[PDB]
Structure 1
Amino acid sequence: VCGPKKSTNLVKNKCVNFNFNGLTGTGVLTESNKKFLPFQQFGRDIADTT
């Protein structure tokens, strides 16, 4: 259940201000080899950051 907000295109390997399903932060988005299981949407670090 998400609000009336249009999406934008995604840009890789550049510093961007991102918003994924309401989750925000700043960082570089890159391709990964992290095998998320089908039920997993977000991953976390030791600091509980994304």
Structure 2
Amino acid sequence: LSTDLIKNQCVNFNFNGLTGTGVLTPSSKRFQPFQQFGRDVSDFTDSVRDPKTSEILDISPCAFGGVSVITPGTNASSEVAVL
């Protein structure tokens, strides 16, 4: 079943019906005995409870953003730095 634990790496998890990708990490949210998973102020399933160990974990987004290139110009140099 490969019910392992990979913390702090972007993986593509699949719980008991809970699919998706992201970086996994331990949570500290106050559940109930009948909670299974929680959601944020948005409509994303944020936190998760282990079907195997009943551990409260929260799910973070993997990685994204924009790229901006920094140049001093062509007639002087050619090296650049990123952001």
TM range (shorter): 0.7 to 0.9
- Which residue matches 1:3? none
Greater relative contact order (Cα 8 A, min sep 6): structure 1 or 2? 1
5+ residue gaps, structure 2: 46-83
Residue number among 22, 29, 47 corresponding to 2:24 in the alignment: 29
Alignment of 1:11-50 (within 5 A): 11-50=6-45
| Aligned AA (2:12) | N
What is the identity, as a one-letter code, of the residue corresponding to 2:18?
L
Tell me the TM-score normalised to structure 2 length.
0.48
3-state SS of paired residue (2:26): coil
How much has 1:22 moved relative to structure 2? 1.9
- Among all aligned residue pairs of Structure 1 and Structure 2, give the percentage whose two residues are the same amino acid: 76
Larger Rg: 2
Structure 1 stretches (4+) deviating beyond 6 angstroms? none
**Residue identity opposite 2:29 in structure 1:** K
Aligned to 2:38, the other structure's residue is in SS state coil
The total of aligned residue pairs comes to: 45
Letter in 2 for 1:40: Q
TM-score, normalization: structure 1? 0.73
Q: Aligned-pair RMSD on alpha carbons?
A: 1.3
